[PDB]
Amino acid sequence: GMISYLKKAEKTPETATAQKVVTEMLAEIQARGKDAVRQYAKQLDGWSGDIVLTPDQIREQTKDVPAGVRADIDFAIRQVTDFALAQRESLKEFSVELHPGVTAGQRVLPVNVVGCYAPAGRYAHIASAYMGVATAKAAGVKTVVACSSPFRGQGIHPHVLYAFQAAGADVIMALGGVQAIASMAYGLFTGKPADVVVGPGNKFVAEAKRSLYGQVGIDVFAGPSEVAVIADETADPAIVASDLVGQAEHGHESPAWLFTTSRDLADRVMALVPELIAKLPPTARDAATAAWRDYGEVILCGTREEVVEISDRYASEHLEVHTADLDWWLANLTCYGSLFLGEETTVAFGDKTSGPNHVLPARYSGGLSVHKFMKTLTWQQMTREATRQIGQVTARISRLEGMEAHARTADDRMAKYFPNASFEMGTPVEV
Amino acid sequence: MISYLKKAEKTPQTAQKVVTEMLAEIQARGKDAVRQYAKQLDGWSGDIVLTPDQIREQTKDVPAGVRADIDFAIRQVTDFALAQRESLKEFSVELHPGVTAGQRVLPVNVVGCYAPAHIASAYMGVATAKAAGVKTVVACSSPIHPHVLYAFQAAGADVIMALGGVQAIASMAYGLFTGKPADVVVGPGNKFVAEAKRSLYGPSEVAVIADETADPAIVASDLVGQAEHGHESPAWLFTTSRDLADRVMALVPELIAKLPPTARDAATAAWRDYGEVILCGTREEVVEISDRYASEHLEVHTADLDWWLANLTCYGSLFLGEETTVAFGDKTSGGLSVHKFMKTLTWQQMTREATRQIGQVTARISRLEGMEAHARTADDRMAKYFPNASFEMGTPVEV
Ligand SMILES: [Zn+2]
Ligand SMILES: [Zn+2]
């Protein structure tokens, strides 16, 4: 019954002045198209060079990326690709017979164009650059357009650019912020408007994606990196603490949660975390100090079932499980971004997918995966014979609804397909 | 090679802020506050949650012939939804040796359905959610048209509530009366209901593709069919045949004129203001157009139906061939399907051996990104699993 907070969030988790800026910028971009984008690039980034990169510029600007660094990025990207490919196979097409003579089915096809944004900020994961691109390509999307702002006057940060290329981007553009999102959405420079745009950004990028796409633009986890660990008495406190500190270095708002049934484990982690932080270099130390302090939580529960309940409520983007009987946890947890089962894997090793935007005040729906880039289209087809029954039912129900024209769609078919037969087609609507 | 033989004459012209007040009251006061708004908006001072007896009583007047019709209609949605559910598969896969990953597929716990009209608008949400395996479906309808109430029950609603508007949506969302907050609420609603759902989790088209083999009488009747809904119902004809386009453009007014008053009025306005007839040179141009307009309901009256099924890429629901038609009913809405009510959860697990490579790749990438704490999670596993190892884990971050 009694859940026990050994450590509480000492601060609670947003002005929408982004709304004005985006409205204004989109208005301008709708008006002047490429020239407004190019001018925004100049005013905001000081950029005067080419927007669309050529295959030669790509090779040139990545030439100084060493083989060891390239092989590591290649490896990381392949982990994503291999999972996305398997996931693509998990949504099947089918046909099914319903009422005899009725056939219906689902087609599954990738969207035509996906735009991928990489903010390439100072403290960014390279995975932010390749995850969208790799996933879209593995979904079968035919055109992936990738944007990242110029790094230091030369062009796109070379690692981000290498990642874009290695992940299979079809077009790469040196563009940042709202004007990148808008250029992708409207198909500026390529003539290929994006069916969806993905990629983490500041509140302006978020707001442009919302404005242009609605819910499908804001249904991916955004905001400070999270980590949660479920642990029982078998868990190693030194590993649990390390993992929490791992994402706490992201910045002062990064939440780090431990859910446990072991008082002993909770106690040791709570003591270990500050010690681990103190041994980080300055930027990380200061970042994690604040993050652990204001957003770090430790929750001791009596039973496994209560852990599940609170974990499902918190719905961490990244959820590690360090327990005996891992099968039970996979079977019983229901809300999270992605699950890391067992001690061996860990959050830093990387996501296969990105979870939904669970911190939205729809919380379970969306995320970055192949499913985001797939359409399911439904169809039906009937023999004449099938309509004998369905025509009747439609006419009658229709006339009960007062939908006289609907009914005649059925009358006309009944007349045409069964000329020498009469049917109870309902009493016509006079009103 | 594309010409509009009939264009749309206008676009929809242009409030729902009270929500905040109703909601703020409901939040602070709960059931009481909702009960308040029941008498005040619907003249209801009975119980909200109906009991099985009430449901049987209030639907006892509904004849067995009508019930059979509705049950059948529901089955044609249910049976499709059951197949569609099985199209999203759980799986496990081995990536890099010793890396296992997978996908669970889980129905949500609770769905709320609002029915404010086609009876289909009442049963589509409920039947879809039940076919998806949702264990609790709450259905609301402002006080209840016996057909709507019969539809809820026959479709498999678990709780039915005589409740309307924002009260209904907020009730289901907060889970007042039942104690079961909906993971999502669905239904057709007014702008108040629209803003209510838009706060809490935030006209019927018809298009016909026709070639020279199409019967223009049937094509006209079908366009007329959905025009009769309101004055804002769009009815689009995409065609490669001027002959059909003219004969349709000719017969539509004559069909409208023969409809009873309300429908005549509705369909006149709609056909005038929103009707479009677009002639194209090639099948490829029709596809280009159809996909741009992405009609919610798209009929195809052509030779070579397989080609259109293969090439059309944007629509809500395809009606393939002449025999079926929009009035027969959707299987899904473009949207509402079983997929809307199911979660995908992804997981990974690794052997120690897998981390030998994955951990050192991670440590090196992490340190290049300036992410020292990240790198240390890899270091710590390497030390635990491979104690005497000396792999390249990258230079520690000093900054
Ligand atoms: Zn991280
Ligand atoms: Zn209709």
Numbering used by the authors:
A (entry chain A): 0 to 12, 15 to 362, 367 to 436
B (entry chain B): 1 to 14, 19 to 120, 125 to 151, 157 to 215, 225 to 356, 372 to 436
From the paper:
Here, we study DHPS-3-dehydrogenase from Cupriavidus pinatubonensis (CpHpsN), a bacterium capable of utilizing DHPS as a sole carbon source. CpHpsN forms a domain-swapped tight dimer with 28% of surface area buried at the dimer interface, with the interface featuring extensive hydrophobic and hydrogen-bond interactions. Domain 4 lies at the C-terminus and contributes to the active site and is also involved in dimerization through a metal binding site.
The root-mean square deviation of the CpHpsN·Zn2+ and CpHpsN·Zn2+·NADH·R-SL structures is 2.0 Å over 407 common Cα positions.
